[PDB]
Amino acid sequence: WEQYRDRVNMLQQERIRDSPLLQAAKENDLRLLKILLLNQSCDFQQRGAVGETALHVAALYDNLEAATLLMEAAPELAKEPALCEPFVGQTALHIAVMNQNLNLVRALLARGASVSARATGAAFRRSPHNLIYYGEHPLSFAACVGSEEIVRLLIEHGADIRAQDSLGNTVLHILILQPNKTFACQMYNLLLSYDEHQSLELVPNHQGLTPFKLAGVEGNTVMFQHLMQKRKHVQWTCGPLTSTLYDLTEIDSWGEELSFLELVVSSKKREARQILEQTPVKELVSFKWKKYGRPYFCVLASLYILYMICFTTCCIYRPLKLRDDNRTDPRDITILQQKLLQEAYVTHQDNIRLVGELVTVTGAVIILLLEIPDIFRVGASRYFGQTILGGPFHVIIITYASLVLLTMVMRLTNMNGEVVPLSFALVLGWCSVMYFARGFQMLGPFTIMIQKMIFGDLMRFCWLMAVVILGFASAFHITFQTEDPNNLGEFSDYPTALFSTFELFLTIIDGPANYSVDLPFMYCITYAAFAIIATLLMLNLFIAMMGDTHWRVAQERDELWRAQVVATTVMLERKMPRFLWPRSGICGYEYGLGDRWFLRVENHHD
Amino acid sequence: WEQYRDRVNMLQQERIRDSPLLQAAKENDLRLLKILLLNQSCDFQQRGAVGETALHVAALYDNLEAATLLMEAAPELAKEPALCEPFVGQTALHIAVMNQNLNLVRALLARGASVSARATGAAFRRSPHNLIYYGEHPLSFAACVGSEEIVRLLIEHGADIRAQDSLGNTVLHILILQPNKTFACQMYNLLLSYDEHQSLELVPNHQGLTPFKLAGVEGNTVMFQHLMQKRKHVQWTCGPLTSTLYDLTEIDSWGEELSFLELVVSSKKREARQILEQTPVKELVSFKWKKYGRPYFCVLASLYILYMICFTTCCIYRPLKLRDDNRTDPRDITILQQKLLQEAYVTHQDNIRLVGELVTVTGAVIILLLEIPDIFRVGASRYFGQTILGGPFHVIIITYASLVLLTMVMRLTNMNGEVVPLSFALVLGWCSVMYFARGFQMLGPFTIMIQKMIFGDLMRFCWLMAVVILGFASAFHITFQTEDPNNLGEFSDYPTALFSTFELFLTIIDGPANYSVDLPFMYCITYAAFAIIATLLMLNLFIAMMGDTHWRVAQERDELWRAQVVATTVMLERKMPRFLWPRSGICGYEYGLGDRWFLRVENHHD
Ligand SMILES: CCCCCCCC(=O)OC[C@H](COP(=O)(O)O[C@@H]1[C@H](O)[C@H](O)[C@@H](OP(=O)(O)O)[C@H](OP(=O)(O)O)[C@H]1O)OC(=O)CCCCCCC
Ligand SMILES: CCCCCCCC(=O)OC[C@H](COP(=O)(O)O[C@@H]1[C@H](O)[C@H](O)[C@@H](OP(=O)(O)O)[C@H](OP(=O)(O)O)[C@H]1O)OC(=O)CCCCCCC
């Protein structure tokens, strides 16, 4: 983090500056660095603050000839790495490779500079603190700085390609993680050119990711297209139109528990959505969704709608009886109460409601059995945090099933107050039907807009709206504390004044007006101020920024709908039985092609 | 001002045109101006309307050879400036320098033309009347016209760099104040090149502003970057990423009472906000806000929210007793009144309200002690006029504390009518919580939008809305003056007709409708006209221009939020004790660097 790196950098510059050997290595004096090196008592193993030698200083400031004098004074400076924590394995070869001083790389490799050196300090890790991630080996350093000849020269002296770091990343992984993609595709070609073969391309990191899977996850569409140039075979071309066969082994991921498409659609990187726009992935999901995914999602949508209708019908016809106790209160409004369990089921219609309630609790147990192990199979925050996988819809469906089982416990144990979980369950259950809106293009991104207004716009403006409601509700309550509550009951106590001011903010109830009595004038002053600031200004401000939130989602409508039908497709292929979801693509074994599955794409060009 | 300048210009052209010597100097006649100059009785000291000589006329119309004949006729014309008020010190050298006639500059400097001449007329001051501001000395004139060789020639003949004018501005100040910056940066380089040294760069004007501070205040981002090229030192570069150390002495402004960042953020010039986008300022405020400013602002926000909760709770539980006098009026609605001070505190809950009220008045005194001297330390209009410093929020918090102290005066002196300052104090206090919305990016510019709709849109449309309310309220009142007020009480008297028409404009109450009686038909005609013009047309017009006001603020959202967290950071560093705010940046004294503080920035490039 920042102050530790700053302390390390000024200490390193101080130990360069005070030491005359390191200063002469820094500023490249040929008047100096010959009198000092002719002393046999002079310490050529003098280290800086981070344990770096004078050769590290000469490689850092691009002093080639000073590094040659430091090398001929003592040849062991190439073997020595730095020692302190942010640079705990860095050699002078790493600095010469990053600086791309190629004659210095030849001068170091003429000496005994190790090519298998691991620069495993904290300044070389993949972190948000570090501005780059190049790896720990000099070969990955030379691949990431983009110099071809240093890569070939490291190949000429050792430096095997298959080197895995602390993250398990091969040089192909780190080259995929670089921001410049077209500048690194040529390096990916030349690094694959020295492959002698478990292949180099198929070895994973510590996250289990293949370079194909890492190119899919990180949004590297250029590298994905480059990797699918070598996985495709043009069957024929004829005039404008050509038929080509894409290998579907790395994309479909049949035997894998965590598939490639599931890895891409549930990735934190946003640009992985443009991975879904690339061709064999696009026709693969189009075949999976049109052939199987849309009818299965439609019959699940209709079955859930019928289950909601059964739940709603057993909610309307719930057992209620006239209350035995008397009212004796003009404010009291309840004329009937809940029925006891011993008298709830005495008739035929109550038995019809019983089989409806049994269907309801069976469906809630089915929901819990379907959605509880998929919380545990992935990250618990990752399951609910995803806007594409239906995470908010997942937590709504989970708490709906929990409220239905709580209602069953309340019914079996004769607990009064069954209105509460039944009302929450009705609202959350019928709002759960919007999960199936993602199966259609016409109302798919509408729920994405609704989600981006719930947690996008409402969570920020709710604080300003809340403090306006608190101030005007407090003023409205204390200006009516001295008045008769029969003539104007909107602000009689503090919770009903809070609720009335919330409804007057949203303009869903009328302004309180009794023209048969004369109200306080401070009601008129504070309500004119409230109607100016809250109903007129802040409400339409919230409406306008909801509008441009809707505009921002509507610009990316097709990509977001494509991503959520991908998440729906991989969810349905993962959850449903294997006989209902046959393996996608051309089988290939009967055509002489060996145990590989393919997708044929015919496209029209010039 | 305009007519005086016009009268001066036509008088000057008249005195040129009537005088044959000045006419021959104007239109460059070599047939003339040899017969006239051979007369020994001819007055070569003949002056125009502004006291300008014939050499001023020859320098004004770029007549070089006419100026040579005027100089060899009488060499003292270079020593004479003009005399009347808009040009009370202007010489012919100033006109020759502005015209960039360099041979005329050599011809004047061959004679005894003073280079320390001050053209201190009203046409050379920094005013909105004058279209340019070049200064009073010819060296600043040559710097601001951008001619390099005239600057070098003036250096060859006197003309010291460190010349301060009536505004105290050095040539560096005036060169910063020029609108075209990149062509003036090389002139700044040349003017710093003849510095022999209190330095030239550190001398202030009469406002106390350094050229660094003036470049920050005026929004000169190009000159700010040029001034920070000489205040930075690259520690190292390595491949794509470099670490460089910025001097933080001129930016942090430790011992100064009016700091650099406070000068930039409270400046009237708008482009100074882009000064906040430049690099060491940006990481300095990012370090100050993330390390210290955001937690201190968050604990102050939570403490103010708890103080509002205590004030609101002692507002709800205020002492009220049943009224002794009888009602005897069907319109009368008050059933209880304020309690006397002798009986207000008799119970334990009244003592809890007493310690809450003591906390409330202590907080109001604390607010007044914190915000009254900062009105006086700056401009009184400047404190409240700033949208970034929280000036409207400052006057709301000031009047909230004033209303709380007025409420304490009413409580101690048993004054009836305590609803009024308590209701205003509740509204203004809970609206003061939006001051702390600027500490978060997600709801920071929302209050800027609210302010730009209060004083931007509402103050212009309130007049049109007001005259519509007056006309329709007057018509609604006089069409119901003849009717029974029991059947329709919305327009019974003129203030309630005004309030009803305001609420019907905002559509927060229903249209008045009694279907048990037959209303006047002019109520239906005027309400149809009102519903067309006011509820439908002008209200949605106000909503639409509120929407594009919101759009205009949302385009500059990050810059406005950055400016207001800068104002928050400099407010918190100025107000809070020094032990809670340590000095920002690297100390530097332990690294051998002499008594200067630095900020290290590491950045990634090609
Ligand atoms: C009762 C239901 C509970 C639901 C539980 C689940 C609630 C939940 O998980 O929502 C998280 C929500 C959005 O989730 P998510 O991480 O997927 O959204 C990302 C990010 O939040 C951006 O704001 C999005 O907009 P933009 O492109 O940058 O403009 C962008 O969407 P997209 O570009 O990829 O489409 C995404 O990068 O994040 C919040 O906004 C903070 C509010 C916290 C949520 C409030 C938690 C109470
Ligand atoms: C009760 C609370 C009292 C509050 C007391 C304090 C009230 C108060 O001081 O507001 C002043 C207000 C805005 O102040 P301020 O000078 O900072 O705003 C500038 C200017 O007014 C422009 O209109 C702004 O918009 P734009 O960019 O050109 O489009 C621009 O904002 P920004 O670009 O910098 O962001 C600024 O250059 O000026 C008025 O609009 C006239 C209404 C007079 C105010 C009405 C006075 C009653």
Curated annotation (Swiss-Prot), chains A, B:
Q: Name one GO molecular function term.
A: calmodulin binding
Q: What does the annotation give as the result of altering D518A?
A: Minor effects on Ca(2+) permeation
Topology Cytoplasmic: residue spans: 1-295, 377-387, 438-460
Reported regulation of activity: Activated by WNK3.
The segments labelled Interaction with S100A10 in the record are 566-570
Role: Constitutively active calcium selective cation channel thought to be involved in Ca(2+) reabsorption in kidney and intestine. Required for normal Ca(2+) reabsorption in the kidney distal convoluted tubules. The channel is activated by low internal calcium level and the current exhibits an inward rectification. A Ca(2+)-dependent feedback regulation includes fast channel inactivation and slow current decay. Heteromeric assembly with TRPV6 seems to modify channel properties. TRPV5-TRPV6 heteromultimeric concatemers exhibit voltage-dependent gating.
The record describes its quaternary structure and partners as: Homotetramer. Probably forms heterotetramers with TRPV6. Interacts with TRPV6. Interacts with S100A10 and probably with the ANAX2-S100A10 heterotetramer. The interaction with S100A10 is required for the trafficking to the plasma membrane. Interacts with calmodulin. Interacts with BSPRY, which results in its inactivation.
Name assigned to this protein: Transient receptor potential cation channel subfamily V member 5
